[PDB]
Design a protein around this ligand. Structure first.
Ligand SMILES: C[C@H](O)CCC[C@H](O)CCC/C=C/c1cc(O)cc(O)c1C(=O)O
Ligand SMILES: C[C@H](O)CCC[C@H](O)CCC/C=C/c1cc(O)cc(O)c1C(=O)O
Ligand SMILES: [K+]
Ligand SMILES: [K+]
Lengths: 268, 269
């Protein structure tokens, strides 16, 4: 019942995508590691509630690696939003609910603000607005050292569940190992400054639902809570840290379903 | 240069307190464990910047244990604020900057709202507004089990620094051992519903500086960040978790001094 296929867009990207279900469109945008297998359990649970769910690997990452260098270098929320619109155009998805974490969160807020006719509502999780020198400095290391360091960071610092993270399995971790250097050299210097949350008044009244991880250290996304509250945007918590769709897939799925249902009611 | 003494207030409490320094008054209200030795390093560093610093063990706790049962049972922010005003009256402290964490945070916001002529400015850290059934349920246990459970929670989960926590020393931990059952039976069921943050408009424009621990799990005091932001109150982070004066005493002292200095400049304007 799950489609697993590839599709080429006129910007040069060959996307790997997955799709399951019928009904209103929900699109799950990966975090910066660009790996859509992290959504696998949740895709079936969401689709089973009457939705068409689409996800994809991000350009330059995992099975979407056949892409021009511009799509995975000097990456911004606005570039990623343009790329997501390209694949939604290719798949004839005219109106969608979107979810994203991390650079995915920056991407879905850019999607909602830039393409309002295309976006029913956006769920953003842990949107990075601050430069981290420790992360930006990994870009000058050798690929194998980047992969070793960032594999450790993801498991021990931000996975929000070491057993679930490791249970993604050897095939997923082998793809992430190859993504870490692409992510390190493309994302951490350019993503945070591109955060589309500098204009608080532009967020006010928008169909945005913002979350942070319950277990995440307060300092990590303190600024998200402040910004959301200043904008009057719905702000709450999911269990775990940076990857709730990995750590707590059933809670994640229920959240996506209930949030989409609330906006479908509000739209009529 | 530290005064270490006792003072009896007509509400029945015999307080243990400490004082150091001369200058504008800064008062350090303990968290619910009620133990003012946790401020020892910071009291000297703050006083050295030209302040008179006062702290005290809280009623029923540590060396302030000679107190009526009303002062350490069914404890509310409003009761604690009335008790702090009683010791400030007894020490002739008319106008003070105040710090408090946890129930001490609830106390200092209650002091600022309820006694505004007495409070130059308040610094509140990790103010509890939510009931926690797992903590409330400890009240029905025997004293020794309460002490073992909460000693473990403070050391390993919320100290923000296990080595600094242990370095409080054997005498402090012997006092905290006796305080854990008093705290368990008198605080967790009644402090959160008494939180003086139901009226966001009452906080607006008040000389309040609110912090949360940088390492604290987001869920613990997420509501503090939301409430402070809604009220336009200065909200920020200190290193560590629930006990910044234990985990990061020099950062804590600097924050108390700089915040007090900011309000002294503003008061003159
Ligand atoms: C050795 C170093 O200190 C590493 C320690 C710091 C941790 O890496 C923080 C981990 C999560 C970073 C998210 C993030 C940040 C960003 O600026 C752009 C992004 O796209 C993302 C994302 O995961 O997508
Ligand atoms: C056995 C369980 O799992 C215990 C686990 C939970 C952590 O103990 C508490 C985290 C911080 C809250 C303290 C607190 C709460 C309150 O309702 C009144 C107070 O006065 C305080 C205070 O420290 O003053
Ligand atoms: K789950
Ligand atoms: K320090």
């Amino acid at each position: 019942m799950r489609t697993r296929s590839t599709i080429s867009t006129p910007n040069g990207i060959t996307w790997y995508y997955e799709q399951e279900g019928t009904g209103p469109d929900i699109v799950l945008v990966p975090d910066g590691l660009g790996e859509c297998q992290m959504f696998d359990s949740s895709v079936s649970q969401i689709a089973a509630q009457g939705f068409r769910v689409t996800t994809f690997d991000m350009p330059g990452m995992s099975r979407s690696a056949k892409a021009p260098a511009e799509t995975y270098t000097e990456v911004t929320a606005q570039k990623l939003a343009s790329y997501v619109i390209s694949i939604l155009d290719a798949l004839d998805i005219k109106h969608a609910t979107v979810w994203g974490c991390s650079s995915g969160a920056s991407t879905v807020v850019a999607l909602l603000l830039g393409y309002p006719d295309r976006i029913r509502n956006a769920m953003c999780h842990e949107l990075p607005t601050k430069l981290l020198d420790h992360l930006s400095n990994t870009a000058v290391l050798e690929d194998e050292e980047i992969s070793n360091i960032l594999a450790n960071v993801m498991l021990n610092d931000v996975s929000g569940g070491s057993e679930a993270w490791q249970a993604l399995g050897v095939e997923v971790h082998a793809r992430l190992h190859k993504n870490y250097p692409v992510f390190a050299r493309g994302y951490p210097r350019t993503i945070p400054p591109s955060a589309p949350v500098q204009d608080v008044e532009a967020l006010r009244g928008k169909p945005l639902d913002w979350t942070v991880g319950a277990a995440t250290p307060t300092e990590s996304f303190f600024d998200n809570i402040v910004t959301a509250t200043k904008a009057g945007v719905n702000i709450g918590l999911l269990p775990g840290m940076h990857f709730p769709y990995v750590s707590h897939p059933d809670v994640f799925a229920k959240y996506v379903v209930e949030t989409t249902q609330k906006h479908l009611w509000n739209s009529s």
